[PDB]
Write a protein that binds this ligand. Structure first.
Ligand SMILES: Cc1cc2nc3c(=O)[nH]c(=O)nc-3n(C[C@H](O)[C@H](O)[C@H](O)COP(=O)(O)OP(=O)(O)OC[C@H]3O[C@@H](n4cnc5c(N)ncnc54)[C@H](O)[C@@H]3O)c2cc1C
Ligand code: HEM
Ligand SMILES: Clc1ccc(CO[C@@H](Cn2ccnc2)c2ccc(Cl)cc2Cl)c(Cl)c1
Length: 403
């Protein structure tokens, strides 16, 4: 457990790790894969541009520093990471490998700046978070395994159907190779697919949102084909589209993820969408509007009219449910869109503009859309005094730009 002095070090130095985040990450993978090349089968080996990797890390580090004295906020951010790690199959015996190489990378990159006090303080933070995470992941694994139709680790599924939904999105329906039941999931949760990538000579693992509602027998995912032409094609989405056919097998993780409505709560729901389409948002809006009624606000951050399937489904729901309050932002309104009949406000969702409308007692907030959108909205809500534990967000479905 960290003393106040050691928390103080972490706090004063988090911006330092952040500022050097790109170099630290590069050195970390280099050192780790050199000792433990088998971990390339669990980590994502596709290249992501520099800024993106720097930011992700900066963000994790700042999230930790900000909540290092607030147990309830800290646990809220940890459970999100526990869910992802449990989806990936992270094991307790891997924590000492990651901590050794992460510390050594911190020292190497920071060079002189990496004082004895700083390395030791961050080694402590590592040991404390690893303890928390291991216990949380073990709970997840055990709870999944005890559910009817649940399991630990990889379970083999068969593609029962494969249907294009657009020229680039294809829906896959999966049933377990053993023919047994499959455990329920809530809208917003994901599976992971683990598959051998022949071009890499490695397994890769990717998360896919689980569509529709559970039925005890099968799962459905919608997979967007990534890249091609100017864009170098993505490994797993292209592999699913072009080589994974009806009758072929894939390995799935049990459903995980903390982004979902608590069907047992009675408190208000603020859904904030940054461009996600009718599928899969509809399943989640359905859960929000199940009886007994809860106050539901939907904040729809769209382009404009050009696609309006989600705007229309929402307007219809707002006519049946007096407990649904709808707000629309169009960031680039079409010449033909007028403020007041086609949308409410110009630009990206701006929560200060609707404060009184969304700042509801004991609400939970559910943000989805592009990753920078979710982050912007997360931080806006934190600035209004909302606790970390009441803000939820995740990649949700195959098209964060559908509307
Ligand atoms: C919780 C969660 C839920 C998700 N749900 C869905 C879902 O329901 N449906 C869905 O389709 N996806 C979903 N995703 C995205 C999915 O997990 C994969 O990330 C996606 O399928 C792309 O993986 P890939 O292996 O095909 O691409 P990767 O090979 O990992 O590449 C990723 C991107 O990088 C591009 N790229 C190639 N070379 C470079 C380079 N030079 N520099 C920068 N970029 C490059 C690729 O074209 C691709 O666009 C979800 C992700 C998460 C985290
Ligand atoms: C205290 C120690 C650890 C911390 C704080 C930590 C933190 C994080 C964070 C913040 C994410 C991003 C989560 C998200 O995108 O939602 C992540 C993802 C991930 N973690 Fe960890 N983690 C730790 C240990 C481990 C261990 C021991 C493993 C074992 C291999 C591991 C493997 C992964 C993988 C494979 C991902 C997905 C990203 C990718 O594939 O490149 N982590 N973790
Ligand atoms: Cl106490 C503490 C624990 C872990 C870390 C960084 O941990 C690495 C390593 N990692 C990668 C996935 N899971 C862990 C990390 C994590 C998230 C991201 Cl986005 C990139 C990286 Cl390089 C730090 Cl700075 C301090």
């Amino acid at each position: 457990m960290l003393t106040q002095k050691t928390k103080d070090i972490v706090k004063a130095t988090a911006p330092v790790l952040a500022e050097h985040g790109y170099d630290i990450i590069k050195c970390f993978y280099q050192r780790m894969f050199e000792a433990h090349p088998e971990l390339k089968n669990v980590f994502n080996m596709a290249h992501q541009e520099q800024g993106q990797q720097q930011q992700a890390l900066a963000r994790a580090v700042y999230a930790y520093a900000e909540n290092i004295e607030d147990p309830n906020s800290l646990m809220a951010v940890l459970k999100n990471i526990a869910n992802k790690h449990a989806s990936l199959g992270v094991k307790p015996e891997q924590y000492p490998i990651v901590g050794e190489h992460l510390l050594a990378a911190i020292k190497e990159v920071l060079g002189n700046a990496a004082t004895d006090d700083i390395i030791s303080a961050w080694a402590q933070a590592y040991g404390n978070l690893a303890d928390v995470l291991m216990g949380m992941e073990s709970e997840l694994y055990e709870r999944s395994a005890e559910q009817p139709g649940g399991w630990k680790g990889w379970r083999t599924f068969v593609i029962r159907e494969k249907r294009p939904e657009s020229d680039v999105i294809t829906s896959f329906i999966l049933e377990p190779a053993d023919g047994g039941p499959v455990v329920n999931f809530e809208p917003g949760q994901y599976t992971s697919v683990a598959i051998d990538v022949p071009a890499l000579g490695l397994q890769q693992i990717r998360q896919y949102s689980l569509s529709d509602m559970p039925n005890g027998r099968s799962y459905r995912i919608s997979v967007k084909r990534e890249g091609g032409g100017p864009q170098p094609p993505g490994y797993v989405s292209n592999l699913l589209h072009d080589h994974v056919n009806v009758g072929d097998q894939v390995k799935l993780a049990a459903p995980y993820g903390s982004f979902h409505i608590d069907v047992d709560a009675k408190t208000p729901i603020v859904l904030i969408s940054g461009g996600v389409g009718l599928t899969p948002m509809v399943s989640m809006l359905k859960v929000a509007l199940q009886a007994p009624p809860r106050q539901v606000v939907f904040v729809h951050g769209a382009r404009n009219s050009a696609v309006h399937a989600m705007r229309d489904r929402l307007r219809e729901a707002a006519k049946t449910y007096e407990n649904l309050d709808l707000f629309v932002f169009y960031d680039q309104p079409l010449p033909e869109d007028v403020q007041g009949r086609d949308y409410d406000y110009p630009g990206l969702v701006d929560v200060k503009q609707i404060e009184k409308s969304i700042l509801l007692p004991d609400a939970d907030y559910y943000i989805c859309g592009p990753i920078p959108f979710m982050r912007m909205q997360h931080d806006a809500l934190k600035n209004l005094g909302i606790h970390e534990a009441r803000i939820h967000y995740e990649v949700f479905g195959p098209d964060l730009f559908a509307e």
